[PDB]
Amino acid sequence: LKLHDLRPARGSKIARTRVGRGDGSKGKTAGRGTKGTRARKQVPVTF
RNA sequence: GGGAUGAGCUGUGGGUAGGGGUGAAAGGCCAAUCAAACUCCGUGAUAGCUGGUUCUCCCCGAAAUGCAUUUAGGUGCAGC
Ligand SMILES: [Mg+2]
Ligand SMILES: [Mg+2]
Ligand SMILES: [Mg+2]
Ligand SMILES: [Mg+2]
Ligand SMILES: [Mg+2]
Ligand SMILES: [Mg+2]
Ligand SMILES: [Mg+2]
Ligand SMILES: [Mg+2]
Ligand SMILES: [Mg+2]
Ligand SMILES: [Mg+2]
Ligand SMILES: [Mg+2]
Ligand SMILES: [Mg+2]
Ligand SMILES: [Mg+2]
């Protein structure tokens, strides 16, 4: 009853990771680290 | 300082247009840009390259080696 009583099951929904938002999280390279290809592009699986 | 009746200078009007013109030839000039003008479009071209990437705390925590490579400042797999 009463729409203000519905809550999702625990573990069903978890917040997305925002990756370029300061030093306390994935800071500036956003997990990329490198200076090479992988810092700006993807490497094809076939290469 | 050079020429200053000459292969002179100059006005007005016109013509040659981009891998094309024009050049007593320097790759010179073609609207302050020229070893291929400019504008718009393809187009948010591509760049193994440079730069940038924004709030917090808790736990753990490297590598800079091997192999191969049109490879050596890149990448794949292993190692961590
Ligand atoms: Mg910073
Ligand atoms: Mg990562
Ligand atoms: Mg890398
Ligand atoms: Mg490096
Ligand atoms: Mg950087
Ligand atoms: Mg593909
Ligand atoms: Mg004319
Ligand atoms: Mg020459
Ligand atoms: Mg000019
Ligand atoms: Mg041209
Ligand atoms: Mg060309
Ligand atoms: Mg296209
Ligand atoms: Mg520790």
UniProtKB/Swiss-Prot annotation:
Part of the 50S ribosomal subunit. This is Large ribosomal subunit protein uL15. Binds to the 23S rRNA. It comes from Mycobacterium tuberculosis (strain ATCC 25618 / H37Rv). Residues 1-39 are annotated as: Disordered. The chain holds residues 3 to 49 of 146 of the full protein. Residues 1-8 have a biased composition (Basic and acidic residues). Belongs to the universal ribosomal protein uL15 family.
